[PDB]
Design a protein around this ligand. Structure first.
Ligand SMILES: CC(CCO)CCO
Length: 180
């Protein structure tokens, strides 16, 4: 996509949980299941505002635990998240370090979602005792996402992806150039 970001409607991803998503990189939180996405897919860099992932909805399905590779199930449920946040390359090399020089992370995945714990997504998705998974994602209509958006936290905040056709397409737009 514009900026050299890698933004595909479907693919393979790794998954982790995180806490504290009330002031996320898109500049609006959402009261429903949400995630951060790795920088190369987010479409912006820290401090440059919303990227084109902002507001888009994705169905996430886990089917492997890379840290418990002998585990065959049960996995959690498929969940639909709205992307509100950025997982920067800096400080997140293992899961979010995809760049234009090396477009997969340490688990071989070209995308990563950090599912926010606060609003319940992680408890639905991760079986008890598992904090990292790999699997698939598919961008879906936000008709499949439940909840309401939060208020704008700063000028330029954007969740416009929530009404966009799937990638490739443009809603909030990408900022700057993808990490290398
Ligand atoms: C998704 C990140 C948000 C703060 O940079 C946290 C990853 O643990």
């Amino acid at each position: 996509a514009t900026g050299g970001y890698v933004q595909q409607a479907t693919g393979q991803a790794s998954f982790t949980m995180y806490s504290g998503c009330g002031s996320p990189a898109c500049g609006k939180a959402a009261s429903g299941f949400t995630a951060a996405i790795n920088q190369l897919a987010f479409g912006s860099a820290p401090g440059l505002g919303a990227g084109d992932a902002c507001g888009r909805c994705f169905a996430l399905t886990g089917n492997h635990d890379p840290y418990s590779p002998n585990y065959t199930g049960p996995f959690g449920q498929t969940i639909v998240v709205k992307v509100t946040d950025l997982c920067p390359v800096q400080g997140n090399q293992e899961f979010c370090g995809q760049t234009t020089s090396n477009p997969t992370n340490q688990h071989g995945m070209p995308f990563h979602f950090n599912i926010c714990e606060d609003t319940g997504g992680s408890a639905k998705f991760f079986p008890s005792g598992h904090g990292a998974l790999t699997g698939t994602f598919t961008e879906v209509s936000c008709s499949q996402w439940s909840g309401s958006d939060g208020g704008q936290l700063w000028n330029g905040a954007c969740l416009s992806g929530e009404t966009a056709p799937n990638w490739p397409s443009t809603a909030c737009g990408n900022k700057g150039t993808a990490p290398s």
